[PDB]
Design a protein around this nucleic acid. Structure first.
Ligand SMILES: [Mg+2]
Ligand SMILES: [Mg+2]
Ligand SMILES: [Mg+2]
Ligand SMILES: [Mg+2]
Ligand SMILES: [Mg+2]
Ligand SMILES: [Mg+2]
Ligand SMILES: [Mg+2]
Ligand SMILES: [Mg+2]
Ligand SMILES: [Mg+2]
Ligand SMILES: [Mg+2]
Ligand SMILES: [Mg+2]
Ligand SMILES: [Mg+2]
Ligand SMILES: [Mg+2]
Ligand SMILES: [Mg+2]
Ligand SMILES: [Mg+2]
Length: 70
RNA sequence: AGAUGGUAAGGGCCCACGGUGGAUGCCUCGGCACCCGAGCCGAUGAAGGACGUGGCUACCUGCGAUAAGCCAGGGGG
């Protein structure tokens, strides 16, 4: 992902509630599966998207853990 | 009547050139010694492991379902 898009992702994430972060992670893990399915049938030439979503999910869960940690 | 040479199936010695083999010399990522520095880790689960982890990934390295990585500060360019 572009550095600017990563910065923005964290800014918006840090404004979300724990509940919204959970819902969002759930949806991104759903999209990851969809990406897996495509990569499995050789229909995902943009394979960089898989790593990207995975790190997004990690960033999201990192912030979720941030919110809950205090 | 007599006398003495050319035979090389193959062999021997020498010479040339190869093959095999990996000595020798050069080399060094590694090692050895001494000296100095530094010196504990663990139930907040250690030491050490198993299994995982990559779009394609056998192994090694890293990492742990957030899985060759997540956040932030510092360095750097
Ligand atoms: Mg990043
Ligand atoms: Mg004769
Ligand atoms: Mg002869
Ligand atoms: Mg002959
Ligand atoms: Mg002889
Ligand atoms: Mg020879
Ligand atoms: Mg020889
Ligand atoms: Mg050789
Ligand atoms: Mg020498
Ligand atoms: Mg020590
Ligand atoms: Mg261990
Ligand atoms: Mg491994
Ligand atoms: Mg960082
Ligand atoms: Mg940094
Ligand atoms: Mg920096």
């Amino acid at each position: 992902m572009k550095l600017s898009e990563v910065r923005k992702q964290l800014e918006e994430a840090r404004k979300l509630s724990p509940v919204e972060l959970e819902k969002l992670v759930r949806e991104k893990k759903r999209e990851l599966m969809e990406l897996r399915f495509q990569a499995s049938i050789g229909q995902l030439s943009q394979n960089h998207k898989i790593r990207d979503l995975k790190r997004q999910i990690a960033r999201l869960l990192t912030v979720l853990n941030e919110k809950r940690r205090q």
